[PDB]
């Protein structure tokens, strides 16, 4: 079995891009954060604790456009009980066609690795956007790096990457740009 079903007809032509959540699109914390964007109750061993989520600047512009250009898949090493609520509040346009959590990662030498080869998509039409180079150790030529984000609101990295994804969404083989 593959992690993903066959892409729907309106997606199958598009490149797949797997998008990381934490420190890529948002940063969360159990330490209280004033003026948080979202707060999400998460049960850990029976006790509910509040998780304070901040949105990386320009994430809404980023997700709305990316959902047009690609078959976008959320792929995080975190747990669904936290990620699904976060994704529900972020994805206001239905950009994520699927969501993949910790149990879909491969544990490789102390790191959770996103094994793109188990997606079920031609790797020449797959990209990964992740703040941890360790997450894409098996497919480094499929990767678009982004710096980890925590709380810098001057950050514009998602905004600055859009013209580059515009190019990538139109090639036939992403390796022609990322070098085979």
């Amino acid at each position: 079995q593959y992690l993903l079903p066959e892409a729907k007809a309106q997606d199958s032509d598009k490149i797949c891009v797997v998008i990381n959540l934490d420190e890529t699109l948002v940063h969360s914390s159990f330490k209280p954060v004033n003026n948080a964007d979202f707060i999400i109750p998460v049960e850990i061993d029976g006790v509910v604790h509040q998780v304070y989520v901040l949105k990386r600047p320009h994430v809404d512009e980023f997700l709305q456009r990316m959902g047009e250009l690609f078959e976008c898949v959320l792929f995080t090493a975190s747990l669904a009980k936290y990620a699904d609520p976060v994704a529900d509040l972020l994805d206001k346009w239905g950009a994520f066609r699927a969501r993949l959590f910790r149990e879909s990662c491969v544990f490789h030498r102390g790191n959770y690795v996103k094994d793109l080869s188990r997606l079920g998509r031609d790797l020449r039409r797959v990209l990964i956007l992740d703040n941890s180079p360790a997450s894409y150790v098996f497919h480094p030529d499929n990767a678009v790096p982004v710096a980890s984000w925590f709380d810098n609101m001057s950050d514009t990295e998602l905004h600055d990457l859009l013209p580059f994804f515009e190019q990538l969404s139109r090639v036939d083989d992403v390796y022609s740009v990322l070098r085979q």
């Binding site: 969360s28 914390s29 998780v51 975190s78 936290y82 102390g110 959770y112 360790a134």
Partner: peptide
Amino acid sequence: LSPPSP
């Protein structure tokens, strides 16, 4: 949260 290691 998405941990580097468990």
